Amino acid sequence: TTNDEEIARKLKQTADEAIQLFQRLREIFDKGDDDSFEQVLEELEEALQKHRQLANNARKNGAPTTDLANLGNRFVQLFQRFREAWDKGDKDSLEQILEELEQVAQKVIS
Ligand SMILES: [Cl-]
Ligand SMILES: [Cl-]
Ligand SMILES: [Cl-]
């Protein structure tokens, strides 16, 4: 098809990467180790940047966007706080911010 579907397909793919990766980060946090955790942490942020960049391109070409959410803004702003909490070592934040994140995700996917 057009390059506008390729963008629609990649928005959808990157959202699925983030959804997948957030589920795994979530449970490493109930388990695992800074090793895997920090690794999944960066994967999730890599997916979300791709998604964001794809979104800019769809907006440029005015592509007909079907956006499953926008707790998307909610999710991204909460994920930025989570990273600041992690990087600050602030562990009590981490648990609160991780719950809010799981709540947004489930609101979108269901
Ligand atoms: Cl989507
Ligand atoms: Cl908070
Ligand atoms: Cl919410």
* Structural domain spans, the chain: 3-109
Q: How was this structure determined?
A: X-ray
Q: Is the torsion defined by CA of 30, 36, 41, 44 positive or negative?
A: negative
Q: How many CB atoms neighbour CB 42 within 10 A? A: 12
For this entry, resolution in Å reads 2.3
DSSP 69: -
**Residues 6+ away with beta carbon under 8 Å from 67:** 11
Ligand 2 midpoint to CA 4 (Å): 37
Q: From the CA of 88, how far away is ligand 3's center (Å)? A: 24
| Helix (H) and strand (E) counts in the chain | 4, 0
Going from the Cα of 22 to the center of ligand 2, the distance in angstroms, rounded, reads: 18
Residue with tokens 């997948």: 20
CATH 1.20.120, domain 3-109, yes or no? yes
Gap between the Cα atoms of 42 and 26, Å rounded: 14
